[PDB]
Design a protein around this ligand. Structure first.
Ligand SMILES: CN(C)C(=N)NCCC[C@H](N)C(=O)O
Length: 64
């Protein structure tokens, strides 16, 4: 189940995010967090793409 919904993040943290385009988990680092939108922008590592994710949706990063 999705137990990791108790996520609290800071900018510059590595994580994994769901790509809007494929819907898959990809490695991304937090570029900015807007606690009011309860969301944060992540930059997909290796790609350079950036999109906004929910703090609670963010998953633990890769082993890199
Ligand atoms: C998780 N991400 C961002 C990716 N798997 N990206 C691949 C496509 C990257 C290209 N700049 C584009 O956005 O079209």
């Amino acid at each position: 189940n999705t137990a990791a919904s108790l996520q609290q993040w800071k900018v510059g943290d590595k994580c994994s995010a769901i790509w809007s385009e494929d819907g898959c988990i990809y490695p991304a680092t937090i570029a900015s967090i807007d606690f009011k939108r309860e969301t944060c922008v992540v930059v997909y590592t290796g790609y350079g793409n950036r999109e906004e994710q929910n703090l609670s949706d963010l998953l633990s990063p890769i082993c890199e």
